[PDB]
Amino acid sequence: QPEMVEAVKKHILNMLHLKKRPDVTQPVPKAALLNAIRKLHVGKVGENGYVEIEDDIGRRAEMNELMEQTSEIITFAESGTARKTLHFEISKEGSDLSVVERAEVWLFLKVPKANRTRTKVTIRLFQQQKHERSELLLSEKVVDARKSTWHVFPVSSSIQRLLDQGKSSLDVRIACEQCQESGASLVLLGEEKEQSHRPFLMLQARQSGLECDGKVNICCKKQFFVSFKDIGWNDWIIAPSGYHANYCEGECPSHIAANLKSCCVPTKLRPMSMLYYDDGQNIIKKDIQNMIVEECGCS
Amino acid sequence: QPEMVEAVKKHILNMLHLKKRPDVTQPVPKAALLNAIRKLHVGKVGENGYVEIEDDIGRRAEMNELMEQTSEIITFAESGTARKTLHFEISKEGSDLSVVERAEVWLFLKVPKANRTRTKVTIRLFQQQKHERSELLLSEKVVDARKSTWHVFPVSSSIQRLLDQGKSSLDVRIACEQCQESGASLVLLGEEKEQSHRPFLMLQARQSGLECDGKVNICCKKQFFVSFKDIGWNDWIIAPSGYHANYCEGECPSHIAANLKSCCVPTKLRPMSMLYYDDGQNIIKKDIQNMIVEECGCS
Ligand SMILES: [Cl-]
Ligand SMILES: [Cl-]
């Protein structure tokens, strides 16, 4: 365990391009430090003097991973069998994704000649479900019918319910009895010169690698969190409080049945930002790549 | 070479969770597509129909790497030997970094009793250089002396010149003859209850792994760019135009003089976003992690 701590310490020093940790010294007073990192927006400070890094690159990494778990699907409407009906055949991708972050229906309201009278019209979207036939109110929206424009119909929860039912098919009847009064018309089939006005459904959805537990020799990640306070480094390391020193252990079966050998290797790496005294007078905010191992696998 | 293309194709399909590429079909008309990805801000379109991804996760990755090459240094002033002089001993970190992105001097103007008369005072910062003694005008700034507040003195180019001269020492004489007229005083030594007003210099600076060239067997990255147009995939792949299929080749010396074996392994991975037809009706924008290999090394 002391050897592990020494190893982690050497690792940190190497990534910071330091030959050793800074000598102890009476540093710049804490008030000065906090004020400086506050004004430069380097570190946000709560009361009692707890410091977090304001522009943490690790948070950006987590955000990127969120994007990596998120897919955006554009489904163009197919003509329905009935009048004023659209068919949406959502890709199987949406079935793999569990959480519906957002879903919109885009319909283009075409107003050939501008009309101020009856400025606003009520558009309704009915999901045609069977078991014989009943209609769900997908969306009831009041829109402006002054000029030709796109209109957006939020249908998040309804698409969520649809996917939860294990379905990716969606037939939509559209109703707008006041539309022609305003001299307006909903482009339901993007045909010919109005083909750039073909309606569509947008769907942004999320989806929601061994760790060493009791696994004997297989390639896995051992989690070893080490607080800087416990290893006597919290004097020159301002932030964060600790370091997730996860590492890859185990052996990997070869390609014997390119390269034959296989190694237990970090397959998922996360960057980490640090705020520290380089000496008694110099505080450094630094962003280090490949600092934290998130997953291990066989090469 | 056809086997390499097949390998890349299989790789892409695997990362997209597809068993094979989508069957050809008469897709949704290009006008509809472009309009849809434009309105949803999924893909920016120039004329002639060239498509780029608007929220490319790869660009975010490049930005993160820029942060990983950038350090921010806070140097607190030490008392000079002369009157109204501050000494800045910049960390050696700044010497490693070549490009000075920005540098500021923060000085706190303390106005005990508010004074509207002589609203503005001229503060000058003189860098005291020798070879006997001459003074450079670091900064000449006109500031408001109504209330006690911080003032920021841009010194980017001057700190750049200092670092270019291979020096990290900086003595600054400060002049403000109009300050006491306005009942103001520059906190030069953050002492006692004014210790949170200790002046400081901020410095944000940048710094500015084998590739297979003719290296026989050492671990390196082979660069293989493949355009989707040339491999007949540009019909269902809307963006980007091609794929940097870089890969790791070579052998790695062992740890014989943990794990003994070492493998040529991607040490630096970059994520890539794709915009593609899942079928004739469904366009998917997806962000894939660990898609592009940027560097290879021995594990
Ligand atoms: Cl130590
Ligand atoms: Cl093919």
Numbering used by the authors:
A (entry chain A), B (entry chain A): 51 to 181, 200 to 258, 283 to 300, 311 to 359, 385 to 426
Please give me the paper's original passages concerning this structure:
Activins, members of transforming growth factor β (TGF-β) superfamily, were first isolated from porcine ovarian follicular fluid and identified as activating factors for the release of follicle stimulating hormone. Activins function both in autocrine and paracrine manner. They conduce signalling by binding to extracellular domains of type I and type II receptors and allowing the kinase domains of type II receptors to phosphorylate those of type I receptors and initiate the intracellular signalling. Activins, like all other members in the TGF-β superfamily, are synthesized as larger precursors. During the secretory pathway, the precursors are processed by furin-like proteases that cleave the polypeptide after a dibasic recognition sequence between the pro- and mature domains, releasing the mature signalling domain from the covalent linkage to the pro-domain12.
We have engineered the protein to enable proteolytic activation in vitro, by replacing the original furin cleavage site with a HRV 3C protease site and removed two N-terminal cysteine residues, which by analogy to pro-TGF-β1 are likely to interact with the ECM, to avoid interference with native disulfide structure of the rest of the protein. To improve the quality of the crystals, we removed residues 259–282 (reported to be part of heparan sulfate-binding site19) from the pro-domain. The resulting protein yielded significantly better diffracting crystals, enabling us to determine its structure using multi-wavelength anomalous dispersion phasing with selenomethionine-labelled protein. We solved the structure of pro-activin A precursor at 3 Å and refinement of this structure against higher resolution native data yielded a final structure at 2.3 Å. The structure of the pro-activin A precursor consists of two subunit chains that are disulfide-linked at the mature domains. In each subunit, the N terminus of the pro-domain, starting from the first visible residue Q51, forms a helical ‘forearm' region consisting of three α-helices (α1, α2 and α3), a latency lasso and a β-hairpin. In the structure of pro-activin A, two precursor chains form a cross-armed, domain-swapped dimer. Although the electron density for the linker between the pro-domain and the mature domain (Glu301-Arg310) is not visible, it has been confirmed to be intact by SDS–PAGE analysis of dissolved crystals. Size-exclusion chromatography in combination with multiple-angle light scattering (SEC-MALS) analysis shows that pro-activin A is a single species with the expected molecular weight (91.5 kDa, calculated molecular weight 90.9 kDa). This uncleaved pro-activin A precursor is unable to induce the expression of an activin-inducible luciferase reporter gene in HEK293T cells, in agreement with previous findings that cleavage is required for bioactivity.
